[PDB]
Structure 1
Amino acid sequence: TNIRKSHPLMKIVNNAFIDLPAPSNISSWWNFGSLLGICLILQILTGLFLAMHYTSDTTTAFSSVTHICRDVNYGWIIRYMHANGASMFFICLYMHVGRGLYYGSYTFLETWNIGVILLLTVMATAFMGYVLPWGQMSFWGATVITNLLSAIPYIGTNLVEWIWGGFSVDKATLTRFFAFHFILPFIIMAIAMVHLLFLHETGSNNPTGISSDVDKIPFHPYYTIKDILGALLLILALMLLVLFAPDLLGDPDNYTPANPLNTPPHIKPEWYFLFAYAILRSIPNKLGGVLALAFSILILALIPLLHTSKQRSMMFRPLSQCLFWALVADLLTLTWIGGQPVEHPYITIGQLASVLYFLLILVLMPTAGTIENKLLKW
């Protein structure tokens, strides 16, 4: 007997990272899971080293962030690694979800449903962090998102004032958000372990959507070296952001300190929230808009029930492929409309893109799968 095989701790590492039967044929698109794990540890390490210098009072929050970037030795790289790591996290999240959608990986019910929880948890995490440097976008972003809860009938006002600790976003709100932002990535790390546990019941899906029991390879050396290469490509893309374009994805209004009395004229999310923001403001009603926003993320939990095809993957499905790419391009359109003022062409096209998002998922893709079945005499 090996030490690696039967040592109670090394057992777990063995069954996850060494001897794990993996599909021979998993692509590039399967790199994003390890990359999400890398993103989490990156956010943990840089974040701790930021927490060593950041203070969470309204009087000193902006100044302490400034102190990191001028005075703290290499505080600027750590700060920018963190800000751009958050963006990398969302890039990897979206590629990973999209892989799941296209390849029918959502048929792993429990694995998928935990991934949704993982998505809602990183979203809550990155929102609360962005508030922390107490810029203008920090404050009004805090204002807009927190007020989404006030649309809830009967209890809504009581709920928002409770999460404020007061009558607006204030002293009580920022300190709260620091504490919640510290705790939540450790909760994420635990839910990510539960995610990986559920996955190991089945192992991985593959590009073909056909069972790969006939052609499994050991995770090591193959996906250990493939994941290494993936990580070095993540490091390239992150470092390009930090060392050449550190403000590219940042809003310049966040370099002005928070003003509670005056909004910016524009007001826009970070790039990864722009589709959902477009969906919210498409509805000329308060409750309608937020319900649409919530439903735009929460729809992923319904994607298993709308599978209609006799094939798992979209690899052998040209109709579904066209409709999937139509969704991606609809999402690109929604990210465009998100980042623009509420004015003439942008309103009606924002409405049409919002309709089409829900039309593709709820109606059009489940009709394509049925037609494709009928076409194959199935």
Structure 2
Amino acid sequence: NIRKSHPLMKIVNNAFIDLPAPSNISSWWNFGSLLGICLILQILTGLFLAMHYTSDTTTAFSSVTHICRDVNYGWIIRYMHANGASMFFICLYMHVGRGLYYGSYTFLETWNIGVILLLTVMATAFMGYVLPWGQMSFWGATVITNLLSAIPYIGTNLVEWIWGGFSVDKATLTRFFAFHFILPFIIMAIAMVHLLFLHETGSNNPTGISSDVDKIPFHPYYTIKDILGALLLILALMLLVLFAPDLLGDP
């Protein structure tokens, strides 16, 4: 009963313990928690990469090599962060595809807040790829940023304003690092409003039929199912990190 009355634990209880959930949500409903696991994985690995990263164009490339060569287990943190970003997009597209198939988009506020989460994670990962300052990093920044030049009558101003110059240069990389640092924390906050609107209605299920006639508590049924799915996420991540860390990157 004390889980229910404490001002802080009542939020945790009504979201992860006593939350009524459908009895029949399939494995496709696991990607919601895996997206949060991915977001927490990227914040931890990313934070430990910023302790040994420099946004100077003349040392940004070398600071990443310094991580993968001299920092104690810096390489494993580095490739978890890179492959974790790819795992993030695997979960995003399955999360979206789940909602399209099963009609979960009829939660308009939750869905529309979802579209915002997709775009910010896309913006976050794009800037992240610019930081190591390789060839694809630079020309990736060149092509995508130049897309704003297509906006009539203000495009070049928006592009040059974003670049901090007449081209992608040192001023562009330093600010992309600041954006890449802070944007994940805004995403975590928006992910809470995502869940806030969801709990108003509770989850959909594979049949698309209301499940109020058959609900089960989130604990212990979906705590352990989410724990099992996380172990499979770690398996998918560690296979890349520990057996093929360059398979998804570009030489």
Does TM, normalized by the shorter one, top 0.5?
yes
CA distance in 1, matches of 2:199, 2:238: 33
The equivalent of 2:24 in structure 1 is 25
How far does the alpha carbon of each residue in 1:339-371 deviate from its partner, in whole angstroms, 9 at most, with x for none? xxxxxxxxxxxxxxxxxxxxxxxxxxxxxxxxx
Ranges of 4+ aligned residues in structure 1 off by more than 3 Å: none
CA distance in 1, matches of 2:246, 2:48: 21
How far does the alpha carbon of each residue in 1:226-277 deviate from its partner, in whole angstroms, 9 at most, with x for none? 000000000000000000000000000xxxxxxxxxxxxxxxxxxxxxxxxx
Task: Classify the secondary structure of the residue corresponding to 2:210.
Answer: coil
Q: How far off is 1:95 after superposition? A: 0.3
Task: Classify the secondary structure of the residue corresponding to 1:201.
Answer: helix
How far does the alpha carbon of each residue in 1:138-175 deviate from its partner, in whole angstroms, 9 at most, with x for none? 00000000000000000000000000000000010000
CA distance in 1, matches of 2:82, 2:47: 13
CA distance in 2, matches of 1:65, 1:167: 27
Q: How far off is 1:202 after superposition? A: 0.2
CA distance in 1, matches of 2:170, 2:184: 23
Q: How far off is 1:18 after superposition? A: 0.1
CA distance in 2, matches of 1:150, 1:92: 32
Q: How far off is 1:184 after superposition? A: 0.2
Task: Classify the secondary structure of the residue corresponding to 1:54.
Answer: coil
Task: Classify the secondary structure of the residue corresponding to 1:62.
Answer: helix
User: Unaligned stretches of 5+ in structure 2?
Assistant: none
CA distance in 2, matches of 1:16, 1:148: 41
CA distance in 2, matches of 1:162, 1:12: 43
How far does the alpha carbon of each residue in 1:81-113 deviate from its partner, in whole angstroms, 9 at most, with x for none? 000000000000000000000000000000000
CA distance in 2, matches of 1:171, 1:240: 35
CA distance in 1, matches of 2:29, 2:212: 17
How far does the alpha carbon of each residue in 1:40-86 deviate from its partner, in whole angstroms, 9 at most, with x for none? 00000000000000000100000000000000000000000000000
Q: How far off is 1:3 after superposition? A: 1.0
Q: How far off is 1:192 after superposition? A: 0.1
CA distance in 1, matches of 2:105, 2:196: 15
CA distance in 2, matches of 1:111, 1:139: 35
Task: Give runs of aligned pairs for residues 48-197 of structure 1, distance below 5 A.
Answer: 48-197=47-196
Task: Classify the secondary structure of the residue corresponding to 1:26.
Answer: coil
How far does the alpha carbon of each residue in 1:302-354 deviate from its partner, in whole angstroms, 9 at most, with x for none? xxxxxxxxxxxxxxxxxxxxxxxxxxxxxxxxxxxxxxxxxxxxxxxxxxxxx
Task: Classify the secondary structure of the residue corresponding to 1:186.
Answer: helix
CA distance in 2, matches of 1:76, 1:182: 19
Structure with max Cα Rg = 1
The equivalent of 2:5 in structure 1 is 6
CA distance in 2, matches of 1:127, 1:15: 35
CA distance in 2, matches of 1:10, 1:80: 36
The equivalent of 1:202 in structure 2 is 201
CA distance in 2, matches of 1:86, 1:48: 14
Higher relative contact order (CA 8 A, sep 6+): 2
CA distance in 1, matches of 2:7, 2:103: 34
Task: Classify the secondary structure of the residue corresponding to 2:216.
Answer: strand
